[PDB]
Write a protein that binds this ligand. Structure first.
Ligand SMILES: Nc1ncnc2c1ncn2[C@@H]1O[C@H](COP(=O)(O)OS(=O)(=O)O)[C@@H](O)[C@H]1O
Ligand SMILES: Nc1ncnc2c1ncn2[C@@H]1O[C@H](COP(=O)(O)OS(=O)(=O)O)[C@@H](O)[C@H]1O
Ligand SMILES: Nc1ncnc2c1ncn2[C@@H]1O[C@H](COP(=O)(O)OS(=O)(=O)O)[C@@H](O)[C@H]1O
Ligand SMILES: [O-][Cl+2]([O-])[O-]
Ligand SMILES: [O-][Cl+2]([O-])[O-]
Ligand SMILES: [O-][Cl+2]([O-])[O-]
Ligand SMILES: [Ca+2]
Ligand SMILES: [Ca+2]
Ligand SMILES: [Ca+2]
Ligand SMILES: [Ca+2]
Ligand SMILES: [Ca+2]
Ligand SMILES: [Ca+2]
Ligand SMILES: [Ca+2]
Ligand SMILES: [Ca+2]
Ligand SMILES: [Mg+2]
Ligand SMILES: [Mg+2]
Ligand code: NA
Ligand code: NA
Ligand code: NA
Ligand code: NA
Ligand code: NA
Ligand code: NA
Ligand code: NA
Ligand code: NA
Ligand code: NA
Ligand code: NA
Ligand code: NA
Ligand code: NA
Ligand code: NA
Ligand code: NA
Ligand code: NA
Lengths: 510, 510, 255
C-alpha cells in the first residue's frame, strides 16, 4: 500500500547529496548540540527512514496538540502517538525559531540537523490523560513524568545517518529495504505480526492462520527498540524469533527487526502500529487481544479493554489503507491438541488451556517444566538460558544498620558457609563505601549470578543507584527481608537464618 | 603411636584455666599486637593443638638453624620444616627478649600470647637452598622471598583459641579429637592418606590397597590450609572427598580436614607430614610418587625425584615411629580394567594408561569428556562445576593504548556484538579509572563468568592489582593477545577480530 | 528343534556320529565348523583335537555318510567392514580381525563387563547375564578354618552384621552344617540363589565331596586358605576387614 500520507519520507535517501555538508555543519564548533536520549534515538530512526511517514521531524505544538486531542496531525492526517523531542529548561532556553541544532548519538555520532519551528512547554497531565488514559502506573505516563524533558522542540529534520547499531546489522530493514525484499520475492500480500515477547506455539498458529485467512506471506516484525519495562531483552527475543521462524513452512515467513520505541498505549498504539507497518510495505496487520496493552495496574484493573485496540482500529478502517486481521484470545485445546480462537469454541463442550506470561516467569524462575504444547523446546531453552532459575540466580545479603555483631566476622561466616555448598556460584564480601561507582556494580554481579555479602547499608540518597532485584535486607526491622530476633543474635544463628531463607527462595538446592 | 617428642602439646588443653586471663592480656591496650598472616594462621593452629608436637611456639634462631642444616631441632628431635613467625623490620624493632606479644586473627580475634625468646634476620638464601633445594620457582622459595617477612621471632606460645573457621565445623578434627574418634571405633591401626588434589580412581585404589596391606582403617586426611598455587580450592575438594568416601566399604574410612600450610617441599615435607600424622593418631602414613612435590620448573626439570621422599622417609624409618606405606606410580590397566602399582607390571606385556593432572585441566577447560575409568562421574561433575569449560568462563578485552578509534564506540560495538550471541554470559563495559578499588574487582567478574570490555589500560604501577587470568590485550603491539593491523582499523574489522579470537579460544560456541 | 542327545565331546568321532544322527532326523546337510564337538585344551594347554580333525574325519567317510557336510573354517569378525567371514577367505594382514573367545566371554559375564554390540545380539546377552550374573549378584561362602582360635560364634556374628550394612539385595546367613550331608548338599543351593553364607566350621574331609567348591572360600592361617590369616587368634575386626576386602577385591561387593 501507499505509505501513509502518500510519500515515503525516507530522508536518508532524500538528503543523500547533503550528507557531507550536513556532517560538516554538525561538527562545526558554533552549532548547538543535543545528545539524543534512548527513546529519541528510536524515534529519530523511524522518522529519518520513512517509518513515521508522513512525519519529517518532531511535532511542533500545533501538530502535537492536534494529535493529543484529535488523534490527527493538524492537517487531518490520522496519527495517534505524539512524537516529540523532549529537552530540559536549560537547553530549551538557548534556542529560538529558525535555529539549527545538531542531533548526536553518544555525544559523538552526528545523526541529523533539526531546524527549529518552536519551543513549547507541554501540559504533561493532558497528554497523560488524553493519550495514555491517565493511570499513573501506565508505562508511557511514568516515562512522561519521570524521564521525559519538560520542554518540546518542534522542527524539521535533515538526515545525516540512522542511529548506530552493531547488532543484527542484516536484520534491521528500513521501509525501502523491506519493500525491495518483498519485491525480489514477488510478495504483494504480506501480513505483519507485531510483538515484544518471545513467540510461543499460540503465536505461531496465530500467524499462520492469519497467513491462510489473508492469503498472504508472513512478516515477523518484532520491536527491538524499547518496550514494556521488565520485558525479555531483545537479544534473547531475536534468538527466539530466529529459532521459531524455522517452524514455518519454507519460504512463507520473513523476519525483520523494527527499532520502534513502544508507548504500551493499547488502542492508540495499535492504530500507530498499523500506520507504521503500512509504511514498511505490509498489506495486512494483525491485532489480537490487548494489543500494545500493559496489562493491569497494581489495583488489578485493566489499562485497556482486551479488545479496545480492535474496536479503535476498526473505526479508522476506511482510512488506514492497510487491512487489519483481528484475532480473539487464541488458546489451547488439550483434548484435540491444537490451538484456536476462543471466539470459535467453548460452550463448555470444549476444555481449554492457557499459561499466562505471569505463570510463565514463575516456572522460569523455579526451574519448572514448561509444557511441550505451550512452547517449542529450543525456545524454552533459550529463555531459561537468559533468565535462569533461582539456583543459578545471583543475590545480595545486606547486613542491616541495626546489626550489633561484628559485621566483619558475620561477613566471613556467611562467605565460608555459602562456599561449602558449591554449585558454580561466585561469592564476594562487597564493600561499597557509599561510592556510586561501586553501588552501580551491585546489580552487575547479581546479573552475573554471583552472591554478594554487603556488610553495610548505603545512605538513602544513594538507594536509587542500586537495583532492588534479589537484594535482601538482614535486620531486626519489620521491613527486613530476613528478620533477626535481636541486633546481637549470635552469628551461627544469623547464619542459619540466612541460609534457610535463601534455601526457601530456591537459591540453594541440596 | 606416641606423639612426636612423647607428649602431645595440646596447648588449648594445657592453658585452659588461663583462658580468661590470657584473653584480658591480649586485649589490654599496652601489649604489642601482630596480626597473623594466612600461612601463620595455619601454623599457629597446628602448634596450639599438638599437631606440631613437640613444638610449643615459633622456632628461635638456635632451633631454626638446626632444622635448616640438620633436619633436627637443636635437641636432636627429627624435624625438617622450619616453623617461624616472620615479621617486618618495623615490627621487629619494637620487641626484645622477655617481651609478650598478642597474636590476632583479622585484627580482631586474639589467638595467643607469644613470649619472645629472640628476634633474628634469617639468610633467606640458605633457607631457600638447604631446605627447599634453591630453585627460584619452587613455591616455598617464592613465598620466602616475596611474601615472608625478613625477620623471625622465636618464642613460646600460650593458647587462647585455635584460629577461627566457619566452614566444615565438624570436620577439622584436632589431634586429641581424632584419637578419640579412632578409639570410639576401636581403631588401633589407621593408615593416613595425605592429599591436596581431588581424589580419583587411582587414589581410591591406592588407599584401599594400603588399607589391605597394613591391615588398617583408612583416614583421608586432606590439606585445607594452604597448598600449591593454582590448586583446586579446598571447598570443591572437600565436596569431592565427601563424595568419594562413599565408594569405600561401609565403615572402612574416616574423613578429617587438616589445616596445614604446605611448603610443597618434597622429601622433607614427606618426613614432616609423617610426623604430623603420627601426632594426629595415625599408625601408618602413605608416601606415593612425588609426594609433596611441585612437579617441574619452567625449564622442564623436576624439583624432586619422583621417589626422593620415599628414600628420605626410608632413611629416618627407625625414628619416625609411624610405619610408612610406600607406593610407586599407580596406573591404569585398560585391557584388565583395574589399577596397579607400576612396579608390579609393565614388561611391555601390559599396556597402561595415565591422565596427568595437566591434561585433566585441559579437558575441564575444553568441556572434554573425562574417562569413566579415570574418575567417578559425581566427582567430575563437582569439578566441572567449580572449574567450568571456556564457554562458561569470564574474560576481559582491554582496549590497548595504541588504539586510535573511538574507544567509546568500539566498546559499544563489542557489547552489542557479544549480546547477540546469548549463552547466559553477563557483559559490561567496565571503566576502572586507575582506581585499585575498581581494578581489584576485575577478576571477581571474570570469576563470576562475566565478560568485560575495558576501554583503557591501567597504569603499569597498578598492573599488579589485576589478575592476568583470562584478560586479553587488543592492540597493535606484538605483545597484544589480539593484534591489530593498524591503530585506526575500522570497528567492524576489530570486532570480527575479537569475536573470532574468543571463538577460537572456546569462549563462544555456535 | 531340541535334540536330547548326550554328547561325549568326542571331536572328530562325534562329528561323524552327529552327522549320522542328523541324517536320521531328516537333514540333507550338516555343518561342521572349527573344533566341532571338541572339548578345547587340557590343563597343560594342549588341544584334545586339532581344530579341523572332525572335518578331516567326516571328509574321509564322505561317500558313505549319505548326508552332505558343509565345512567351515574359523568364522571371525571384521571390524573395519562390520561383518563376519570365514578366516580361510581373508587375512593376509591386509585385513584385521576380532574374536571374543568363550573364555573371555565368561570373564565379562562374571565381571559385569560390556559385551560388544558386534559380538552378540543384546537380547541374548541379557538372557545370559540373567542366568550367569556378575559377581556383585553372586553368592558365596566363607568357611571359618579349623586353625581358627577366636570365638567362632562372635566372628560369625561380626561378619553377618558387617555384610548386612552393605546392602545390595544379597541374603546372608550363618549356616551350621553339623557334618550332615543333608545340610552340606544345600550349600551350593544358596550360593546358586545368590546368598552369602558364613560357615563357622569345616566339614570332615570324607564329606568334602558333597559340597561344590564353587564360590566357597576358606579363611584360615594355612597356606591353602583362600583368605590367609596372620595368626589363629587375630582379632575379629582384623579378620573382618580381611574378609571384606578380599570379597571386595573379587567383585562380590561394589561400593
Ligand atoms: N493469545 C492471543 N490471542 C490473540 N492475539 C494475541 C495473543 N497473544 C498475542 N496476541 C497478539 O500478538 C501481538 C503481539 O503480542 P505481544 O508481544 O504479547 O504484545 S504487544 O504489546 O506487542 O501487543 C498483538 O497483536 C497481540 O494482540
Ligand atoms: N599415581 C600415583 N601413584 C602413587 N602415588 C600417588 C599417585 N597419585 C598420588 N599419589 C600419592 O597421593 C598422595 C597425595 O597426592 P596429591 O594430592 O596429588 O599430592 S601431594 O602434594 O598431597 O603429595 C601422595 O602420597 C602422592 O605421592
Ligand atoms: N567361529 C566358528 N567358526 C566355524 N565354526 C564354528 C565357529 N563357532 C562355532 N562353530 C561351529 O558351530 C557348531 C557348534 O558350536 P558349539 O556349540 O560351540 O560347539 S559344539 O560342541 O556343538 O561343536 C560346530 O560345528 C562348531 O564347529
Ligand atoms: O512469554 Cl514471555 O513473557 O516469556
Ligand atoms: O587432579 Cl586435579 O589436578 O584436578
Ligand atoms: O560360552 Cl558361551 O558362548 O557363553
Ligand atoms: Ca519535570
Ligand atoms: Ca480483563
Ligand atoms: Ca543480647
Ligand atoms: Ca625481603
Ligand atoms: Ca620426571
Ligand atoms: Ca590508517
Ligand atoms: Ca589350538
Ligand atoms: Ca597371638
Ligand atoms: Mg540503525
Ligand atoms: Mg579453627
Ligand atoms: Na564521550
Ligand atoms: Na485532568
Ligand atoms: Na481482504
Ligand atoms: Na473499552
Ligand atoms: Na490504498
Ligand atoms: Na516459605
Ligand atoms: Na610409639
Ligand atoms: Na577490621
Ligand atoms: Na606393618
Ligand atoms: Na633424587
Ligand atoms: Na621409635
Ligand atoms: Na588457534
Ligand atoms: Na589333527
Ligand atoms: Na550313500
Ligand atoms: Na587381587
Amino acid at each position: 500500500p501507499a505509505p501513509h500520507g502518500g510519500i515515503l519520507q525516507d530522508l536518508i535517501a532524500r538528503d543523500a547529496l547533503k550528507k557531507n555538508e550536513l556532517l560538516s555543519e554538525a561538527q562545526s564548533s558554533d552549532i548547538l548540540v543535543w545528545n539524543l536520549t534512548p527513546r529519541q534515538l528510536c524515534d529519530i530512526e523511524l522518522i529519518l527512514n520513512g517509518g513515521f511517514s508522513p512525519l519529517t521531524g518532531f511535532l511542533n505544538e500545533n501538530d502535537y496538540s492536534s494529535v493529543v486531542t484529535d488523534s490527527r496531525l493538524a492537517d487531518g492526517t490520522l496519527w495517534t502517538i505524539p512524537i516529540t523531542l523532549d529537552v530540559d529548561e536549560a537547553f530549551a532556553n538557548q534556542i529560538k525559531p529558525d535555529t539549527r541544532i545538531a542531533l548526536f548519538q553518544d555525544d559523538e555520532i552526528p545523526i541529523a540537523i533539526l531546524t527549529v519551528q518552536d519551543v513549547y512547554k507541554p501540559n504533561k497531565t493532558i497528554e497523560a490523560e488524553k493519550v495514555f488514559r491517565g493511570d499513573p502506573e501506565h508505562p508511557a505516563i511514568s516515562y512522561l513524568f519521570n524521564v521525559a524533558g519538560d520542554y518540546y522542540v518542534g522542527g524539521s529534520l535533515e538526515a545525516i545517518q540512522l542511529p548506530q547499531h552493531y547488532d543484527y546489522p542484516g536484520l534491521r530493514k528500513t521501509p525501502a529495504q523491506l519493500r525491495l525484499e518483498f519485491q525480489s520475492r514477488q510478495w504483494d500480500r504480506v501480513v505483519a505480526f507485531q510483538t515484544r515477547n518471545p513467540m510461543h506455539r499460540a503465536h505461531r498458529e496465530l500467524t499462520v492462520r492469519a497467513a491462510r485467512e489473508a492469503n498472504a506471506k508472513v512478516l515477523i516484525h518484532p520491536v527491538v527498540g524499547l518496550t514494556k519495562p521488565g520485558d525479555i531483552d531483545h537479544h534473547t527475543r531475536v534468538r527466539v524469533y530466529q529459532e521459531i521462524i524455522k517452524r514455518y513452512p519454507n519460504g512463507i515467513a520473513f523476519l525483520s527487526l523494527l527499532p520502534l520505541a513502544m508507548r504500551m498505549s493499547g488502542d492508540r498504539e495499535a492504530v500507530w502500529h498499523a500506520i507504521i507497518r503500512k509504511n514498511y510495505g505490509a498489506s495486512h496487520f494483525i491485532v489480537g487481544r490487548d494489543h500494545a496493552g500493559p496489562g493491569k495496574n497494581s489495583k488489578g484493573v485493566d489499562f485497556y479493554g482486551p479488545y479496545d485496540a480492535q474496536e479503535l482500529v476498526e473505526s479508522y478502517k476506511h482510512e488506514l489503507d492497510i487491512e487489519v486481521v483481528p484475532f480473539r484470545m487464541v488458546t489451547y485445546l488439550p483434548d484435540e491438541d491444537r490451538y484456536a480462537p476462543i471466539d470459535q469454541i467453548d460452550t463448555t463442550k470444549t476444555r481449554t488451556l492457557n499459561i499466562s506470561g505471569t505463570e510463565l516467569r514463575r516456572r522460569l524462575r523455579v526451574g519448572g517444566e514448561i509444557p511441550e504444547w505451550f512452547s517449542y523446546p529450543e525456545v524454552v531453552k533459550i529463555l531459561r538460558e537468559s533468565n535462569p532459575p533461582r539456583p543459578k540466580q545471583g543475590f545480595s545479603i545486606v547486613l542491616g544498620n541495626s546489626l550489633t555483631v561484628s559485621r566483619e566476622q558475620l561477613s566471613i561466616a556467611l562467605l565460608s558457609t555459602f562456599l561449602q555448598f558449591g554449585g558454580g556460584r561466585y561469592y564476594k564480601i562487597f564493600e561499597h563505601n557509599n561510592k556510586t561507582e561501586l553501588l552501580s556494580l551491585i546489580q552487575d554481579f547479581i546479573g552475573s549470578g554471583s552472591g554478594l555479602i554487603i556488610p553495610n547499608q548505603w545512605e538513602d540518597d544513594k538507594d536509587s543507584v542500586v537495583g532492588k532485584q534479589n537484594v535482601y535486607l538482614l535486620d531486626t526491622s519489620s521491613s527486613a527481608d530476613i528478620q533477626l530476633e535481636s541486633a546481637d543474635e549470635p552469628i551461627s544463628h544469623i547464619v542459619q537464618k540466612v541460609v534457610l531463607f535463601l534455601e526457601d527462595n530456591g537459591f540453594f538446592v541440596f
